[PDB]
């Protein structure tokens, strides 16, 4: 059968294990000869694997691409210290007797630590603290309790140098260098019983194994060799490092065999130690990194695992995948929110493997007969034996007549297929959702507009990735869990995320506003466009010139369910006295007459009774993101499919309404009368006079300092407050003369796009430009620009733009606005990286937490983090405004349903 990995046990490889697992001994530094054949005994020996296609492995007998590679070994002439175990070696040497070999602890202390180790074993932090305490206790001891032999302090010098402070005959203290052979001999005397006290395992990690005597050379598959376009081989950095190691080891062995003096032996030993240390880690502190001939700092085994481009993050936690596509996205309101537009070229390339069954034999046979060049067709066919056959014109008929039950047909992407649609960066779980394939002739992806806010995607050149699941389990998981309609409500705040946007909101406002009426032709056309299942028109609301007319509220009410009742205040409510009468009428009777409601109907108060929009207008509070009460109620009380249908119908209806009525903005939308401009100029002049008076008072010393601040900050705060008040007054003056008939004002007030402040800047004035919360000061001595006098603290000299976008900015005001915009762009480009790093840290901290079947949240070890998730066991996605149950809404809905 098949087996899976249950657990992984780590340790230090013994020299005997390295020798036994080795397939060959490497002694020749050279890799390839002049003819290009591998050299026997070299680093590219065929016993370690094969890279070239024509080569055959002497250990496996297989060809390139399927030989896994085999490890070698190098017999070092002298032992060397592993740089990754240097601190542990120093700690163990400090914590152990030099000649006796036992740990410098009493028997009672050893027993006490042995019993304490069993109690604290689950938490690795407790074990680390116990190890540190044992090391600290054993370090201060200068006499071994087991034998009474005197001890000397051991000094550790980076990277792998150990100094022993021995005492001379006259009492002088001199440093004695401990060679790796002496260190290994000292480590060999430690018994197995003291190893748990030192944090080592008797059978897995012996202390003497931390001093390397046999170096395992990696297989050639781990360090592949390529050839360039000019025929010159490009060896890996590990290959060059191993070449240097082999050369130095051979030179050291030859010098040892030649009886060289000890001075040469120490130099060669140090060179070999440096080479081994750089091979293990080329970024070790205090070590000059190994450099290539061209000057390139080589990357080694340590660099291949850590970092963004390491083995873990770059190849294990994340990697490139097959059956994926990426292209520019384009809007498509005609498709549903559950659908994605797939190009025909993309569909004809990406394939889904479908097994031949009894109920789909004819379809797959037709797909095979069509071939790869005829849509809908197939590209590959897999027999039950498991081999893959490519489909072409010559053999498409032979395969088609040979098709049977159990075959696999890699047909092209068809309508209704489930694929993954993703936009980067993936900040939340809504960044990847499963859509339905819709095949289109052009070369762009198509995404429905309400699905843009979950992706945070616009259409100014955005590109998105498409993934096609290949297994039945993955397809089922995508279809059940990751469908678009299943994630309308955002789990972050428990509100709508897949909601209407600017044009939908504007069209809804245009349709549902007071005085909006449509002819029979317009109503029928918008009903056909929206796909609503309406066969007969309702009774006309009024007649004009002998022609029937339908109110927009009547057309909008066809979308709502017949048993839906809700009332609230939208963003268009500017006269609360009109909403108060409606609220009192609703409260008094709880079933108000529809004629009575329409008599005192107000656009700012939306009231839906039994699915009929009796009052109010559609805005961002209707079905907008994070504010749509109607959409949120529809999701919670009618399911996700009904909500998806409602969204698909209402988006098309509002799009038709806004398209044929005519929505536009012009240069006269920001126009203001002369009296408004005069008032704005008067406000600006008054603010400038106030700033000048404050400056004069500060110069005369009459300014009262604020608590906790000196005169300069007090004056700056007063000036900024005055300028902000002036900007607010100018904005109010501009808002006074901009009525509801303005399309830009409609867009700002309905929440479709933009703000009132955006219209204020173009109409009245820009205001004060500031960076880092302070007025502009960077420039010359005492002045931002030379055009102003030195020492001028006035508003105009510090970044107060009196002009507006329509009036035209002065060059100084242009420079100030450029400073502000640069500050904003820099702030965004700096904040993004910190936010991403914090998100990665949080993800890695809370990756393993999940809710068990009993409602508890536990770590993989088993420690209970929460006895109930959220202390109430309620999903934030299904929570009503952060609460457990919306009691008032339930009571009101039940009472209305039973009394209606």
């Amino acid at each position: 059968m098949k087996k899976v990995i249950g657990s992984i046990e780590f340790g230090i490889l013994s020299p005997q294990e390295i020798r036994k697992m080795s397939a060959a001994e490497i002694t020749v530094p050279d890799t390839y000869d002049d003819d290009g054949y591998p050299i026997e005994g070299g680093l590219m020996d065929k016993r370690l694997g094969v890279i070239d296609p024509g080569l055959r492995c002497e250990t496996c007998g297989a060809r390139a691409g399927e030989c896994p590679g085999h490890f070698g070994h190098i017999e070092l002439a002298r032992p060397v210290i592993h740089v990754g175990f240097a601190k542990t070696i120093h700690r163990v040497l400090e914590s152990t007797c030099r000649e006796c070999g036992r740990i410098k602890l009493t028997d009672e202390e050893i027993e006490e630590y042995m019993q304490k180790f069993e109690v604290m074993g689950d938490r690795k932090g407790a074990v680390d603290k116990l190890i540190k305490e044992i090391h600290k206790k054993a370090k201060e001891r200068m006499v071994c309790p087991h034998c009474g032999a005197p001890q000397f302090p051991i000094k550790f010098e980076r990277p792998t140098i150990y100094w022993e402070l021995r005492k001379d005959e006259e009492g002088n203290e001199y440093k004695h260098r401990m060679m790796p052979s002496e260190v290994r001999d000292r480590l060999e005397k430690i018994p197995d019983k003291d190893l748990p006290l030192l944090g080592l395992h008797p059978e897995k990690s012996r202390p003497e194994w931390m001093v390397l005597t046999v170096l395992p050379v990696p297989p050639v598959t781990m360090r592949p060799s390529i050839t360039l376009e000019s025929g010159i081989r490009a060896e890996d950095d590990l290959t060059h490092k191993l070449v240097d190691i082999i050369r130095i080891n051979n030179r050291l062995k030859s010098n040892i065999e030649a009886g060289a003096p000890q001075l040469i032996i120490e130099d060669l030993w140090d060179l070999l130690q440096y080479h081994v240390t750089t091979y293990i880690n080329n970024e070790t502190s205090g070590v000059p990194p190994a450099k290539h001939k061209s000057g390139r700092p080589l990357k080694t085994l340590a660099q291949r695992l850590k970092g963004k481009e390491g083995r873990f993050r770059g190849n294990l936690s994340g990697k490139r995948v097959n059956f994926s596509a990426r292209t520019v996205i384009s809007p498509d309101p005609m498709i549903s929110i559950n659908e994605v537009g797939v190009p025909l070229a993309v569909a004809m390339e990406l394939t889904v493997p479908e097994k031949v069954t009894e109920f789909n034999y004819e379809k797959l046979k037709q797909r095979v007969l069509n071939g790869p060049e005829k849509y809908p067709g197939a590209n590959y066919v897999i027999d039950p034996e498991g081999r893959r056959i490519r489909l072409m014109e010559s053999n498409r008929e032979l395969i088609a007549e040979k098709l049977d039950i159990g075959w696999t047909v890699e047909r092209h992407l068809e309508d209704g297929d489930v694929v993954l649609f993703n936009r980067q960066p993936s900040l939340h779980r809504m960044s990847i959702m499963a859509h339905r394939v819709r095949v289109m002739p052009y070369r762009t992806f198509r995404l429905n507009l309400p699905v843009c806010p979950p992706y945070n995607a616009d259409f100014d050149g955005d590109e998105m990735n498409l993934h096609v699941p290949q297994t039945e389990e993955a397809q089922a998981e995508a279809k059940i869990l990751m469908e678009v309609q299943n994630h309308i409500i955002s789990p972050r705040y428990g509100g709508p995320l897949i909601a209407g946007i600017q044009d939908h909101i504007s069209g809804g406002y245009l349709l549902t506003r007071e005085g909006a009426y449509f002819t029979r032709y317009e109503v029928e056309q918008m009903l056909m466009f929206a796909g609503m299942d309406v066969n007969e028109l309702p009774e006309p609301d009024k007649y004009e010139n002998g022609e029937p007319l339908w109110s927009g509220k009547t057309i909008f009410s066809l979308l709502l369910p017949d048993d839906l009742t809700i009332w609230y205040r939208n963003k268009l409510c500017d006269e609360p006295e009109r909403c108060e009468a409606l609220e009192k009428l609703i409260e008094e009777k709880l079933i108000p007459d529809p004629e009575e409601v329409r008599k005192l109907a107000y656009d700012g108060f939306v009231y839906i009774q039994n699915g009929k929009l009796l009052s109010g207008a559609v805005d961002k509070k209707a079905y907008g993101r994070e504010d749509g009460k109607l959409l949120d109620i529809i999701v919670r009380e009618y399911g996700v499919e009904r909500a998806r249908q409602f969204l698909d119908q209402v988006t098309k209806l509002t799009i038709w309404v806004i398209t044929h009525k005519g929505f536009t903005t012009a240069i006269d939308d920001e126009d203001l009368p002369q009296e408004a401009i005069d008032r704005i100029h008067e406000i600006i002049r008054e603010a400038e006079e106030k700033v000048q008076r404050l400056i004069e008072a500060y110069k005369r010393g009459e300014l009262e300092p604020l608590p906790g601040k000196t005169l300069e900050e007090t004056l700056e705060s007063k000036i900024m407050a005055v300028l902000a008040e002036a900007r607010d007054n100018a904005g109010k003056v501009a808002e006074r003369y901009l009525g509801m008939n303005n399309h830009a004002v409609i867009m700002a007030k309905t929440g479709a796009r933009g703000k009132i402040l955006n219209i204020t800047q173009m109409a009245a004035m820009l205001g004060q430009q500031s960076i880092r919360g302070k007025r502009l000061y960077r420039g010359y001595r005492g002045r931002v620009l030379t055009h102003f006098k030195p020492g001028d603290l006035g508003a105009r000299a510090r970044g107060f733009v009196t002009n507006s976008y329509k009036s035209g900015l002065t060059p100084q005001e242009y420079f100030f606005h450029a400073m502000g915009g640069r500050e904003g762009l820099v702030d965004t480009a700096v904040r993004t990286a910190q936010s991403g790093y914090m998100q990665r840290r949080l993800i890695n901290a809370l990756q393993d937490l999940k809710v068990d079947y009993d409602g508890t949240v536990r770590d993989p070890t088993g420690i209970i983090v929460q006895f109930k998730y959220g202390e109430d066991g309620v999903d934030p996605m299904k929570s009503w405004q952060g609460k457990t149950v919306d009691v008032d809404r339930v009571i009101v809905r039940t009472l209305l349903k039973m009394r209606g």
């Binding site: 689950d122 209970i864 202390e871 109430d872």
Partner: protein, 77 residues
């Protein structure tokens, strides 16, 4: 003197009995080492006079559930 439990941020702390601790362990099917830990030098522990090895029942003021029960095991510093 100012009691440590009069603060709004400090929830009620109560030392569980032996039978109560055994019932709590049996209910969640966990060992004594799978519970959250509280240091013996904690002000609540020294106010209650508890010793390492006991389980403290904490009556949290839940913003969502009103009142929530949390359990912590006293451990040495």
């Amino acid at each position: 003197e100012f009691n440590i439990f009069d603060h709004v941020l400090v929830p009620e702390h109560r030392i569980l009995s032996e039978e109560e601790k055994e019932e709590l362990l049996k209910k969640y099917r966990i060992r004594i080492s799978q519970l959250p830990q509280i240091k013996a030098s904690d002000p609540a522990v020294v106010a209650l006079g508890a010793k390492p090895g006991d389980v403290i029942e904490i009556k949290r003021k839940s913003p969502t559930a009103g009142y929530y029960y949390y359990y912590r095991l006293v451990v040495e510093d």
